[PDB]
Design a protein around this ligand. Sequence first.
Ligand SMILES: CC[C@H]1C(=O)Nc2ccc(F)cc2N1C(=O)OC(C)C
Lengths: 400, 539
Amino acid sequence: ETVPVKLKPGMDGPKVKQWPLTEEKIKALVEICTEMEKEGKISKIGPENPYNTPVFAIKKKDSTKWRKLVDFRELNKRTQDFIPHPAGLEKKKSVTVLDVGDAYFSVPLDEDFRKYTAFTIPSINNETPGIRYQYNVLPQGWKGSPAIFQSSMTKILEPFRKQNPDIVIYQYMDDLYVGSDLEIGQHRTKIEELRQHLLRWELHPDKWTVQPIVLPEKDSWTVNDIQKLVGKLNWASQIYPGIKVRQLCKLLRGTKALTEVIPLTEEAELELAENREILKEPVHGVYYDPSKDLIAEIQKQGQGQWTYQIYQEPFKNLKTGKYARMRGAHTNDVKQLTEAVQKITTESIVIWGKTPKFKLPIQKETWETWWTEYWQATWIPEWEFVNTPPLVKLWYQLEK
Amino acid sequence: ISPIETVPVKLKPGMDGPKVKQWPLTEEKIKALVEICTEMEKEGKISKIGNPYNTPVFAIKWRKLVDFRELNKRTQDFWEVQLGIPHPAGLEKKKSVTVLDVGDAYFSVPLDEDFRKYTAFTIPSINNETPGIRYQYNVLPQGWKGSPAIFQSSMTKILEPFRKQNPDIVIYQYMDDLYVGSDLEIGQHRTKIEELRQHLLRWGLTTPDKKHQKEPPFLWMGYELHPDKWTVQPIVLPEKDSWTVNDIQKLVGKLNWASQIYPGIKVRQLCKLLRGTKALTEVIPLTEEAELELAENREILKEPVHGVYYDPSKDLIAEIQKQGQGQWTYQIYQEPFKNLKTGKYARMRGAHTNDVKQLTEAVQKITTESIVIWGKTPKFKLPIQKETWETWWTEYWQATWIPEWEFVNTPPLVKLWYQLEKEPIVGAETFYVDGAANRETKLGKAGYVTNRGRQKVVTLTDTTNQKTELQAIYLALQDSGLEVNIVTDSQYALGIIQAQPDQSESELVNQIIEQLIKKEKVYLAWVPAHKGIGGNEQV
Ligand SMILES: CC[C@H]1C(=O)Nc2ccc(F)cc2N1C(=O)OC(C)C
């Protein structure tokens, strides 16, 4: 029994190249892949199958074993289309994610669609022709899986849902998001309860928003101080038209030494005051648009600090934030960035139920050869690489 | 009829079989083909038939040739045969290594009967009229899109067994070859080869007898391979009295290739000879330098470059050198002075970068390489102080990284040619710079005004929007003490400079960089253009 899944009109199968992998990772994929083949989850394939999808191995949150991960991004895009977001999920005192990837294997994949799910296991130095396989069951990571399995998913969920209502359950791809206001102990104990249920077959959203910008405060100001202050505000006026630098810029006339101290006019004084007040809140009229793509930009602040914004339109932020590197990532820019992107995406899902498109301050090559080494999530957002404009940085560096 | 199952082949969706016309051929070319097609028929490779589709047959004793170019254009895509093949440096030492030319094996594999119809071709006639001799292929056609692919795979499955039965035996299939190696004793080995051979044969696969099989060392993308080590095939540099462009280009190509293995190779002067060349056949006299350069190269190329295979039980170490700005060299070894590999990276030339950055890139290329050669990352021995690294990285605007590495003091070291001040400098003159130029004319001026009253301005002809500003800045630098402050409304400075480049495409920039490097302390500050902002309102 299977539903006849198809590709979007006129779309052809993915033919993406496999990137090189650490010997270690390769050894695992093979171990893993033989297991699945035994259990009939996959089958080696003929050369008459030209498609391909990248695959790799990870060791997510706390484990001595490797997990197979497949990048179906392309496939996903070409897959035809087919539950809405629980506007309250965002409003719960605590959320917990769940990996229900396994549930999928319990289902046959349409016969004529499998070819497109083809993947390749490499061999160091091309000393061996790669190991070609294609799925027989719904694979983890493909957008089709959560769907075709929606039916049996809800079915097994009702009894727990209906049993609590003060708890929310949201499913994104391989993942499951659940939130409750119950205290920590109860929350967790209740989670396990859910796991148990499923077995039969740490977010706190209340801190996320657009963030507060604070301007410097000083005993005495220098020309420089003021020039910098002014460049910032001026820019900021693309977000707040009420922000004004008239008075301040007047103090800047003549050609004084960058280090000379300037006394502030009462006007300038009020101006500063007036701007501080305008900035006390996020710009008005910012509403998420479901029809548009969600954008998530990131800046390197340094010293392990990282700012980010999530918007759909320029200078209209749905949310902004800082992220400070985790323990033991010190010498690793890539790890931190990777860490943050995952965090920002989870938080994006939690809120609007989808992943944003990232703009990364890192070279494509650097990112490509190492991101997989620290990835842990079942999903994989979209991304492009960019050059950070100096001011965007200085500005967001000012958040409280 | 034959052992192996066929693979299911399809024509691209919508397309259909070839329809080409058979050229007219001489009476002696026809006879030759008639005879070949009879044998082939016998041997069972082709079947007599006489089918809408047709492909042109040729004649080059005579040897036949069929043109599938059309068929191919109509043949489904396959899973491509990797063009990325083993690099000596990533191979293992074997007590022995054989090679089995399975040349005739191509035609030893059944073609999806369902698809044979398409291969239909026709032997012409002297009689423009008479019914041509019609045939089609039963096996993989020499020169057909699918051939390469299929065959390997087939081969692959046939070895599946034997490999499984012999975990201590490495087999490598390339083209119509099989590099079978191992660490067993010569008889043990010999015996196994012979075992392999009969197994292949059990599948209708033919190999040459022991009194035919090729010999070591082996030729591999530039090297001679012994089972215990490799040596570079010595490269021959012509010696002519007349050098054409073509000549110099080939040469250069060759020389460049050498740079990797051999150290000290240069082509700057040889490369010069190609300036303004009007034709490939054009003869260019070698200058003195070019005559010299070329000489030292012949000397270097004599030297035998011997190498060592990959010992999976030892550290993989890469050490790097800056052979010049943007020029880097590296060698990868496991034992001091016994490299499995070396190479150099061409002077990548950007729009604006710095050495530390460039170093980082080299490191990443190297890394990606090894991940392939060895599926592992090397421990880096780098000509840069950890202090330097930590200073630059911790604050660079762009996410960067270098895997495990250690400092190695081998001049010239890679450093920060200069560091813009974190704060304005007290007592240091403050230049308020600005440049303006007629967008369209390429006429402009650039100058500054300091707090100390010093002023200047220059008119510039044939200049752009950006160039003036930068020049403004340039001037300020020239005309200031070892310490200066410079304020500018240039967006271009804010980045390009504040991102502290020590090399660029823009010559101007280059100059500013030279200047910057010279000072003792420089603080740059940016301010919004076209504002009541003083200084900026002077400009
Ligand atoms: C089969 C053994 C395998 C290997 O590990 N080391 C060597 C060493 C020397 C050789 F001449 C060949 C090879 N081998 C190989 O596959 O090389 C192909 C590129 C020709």
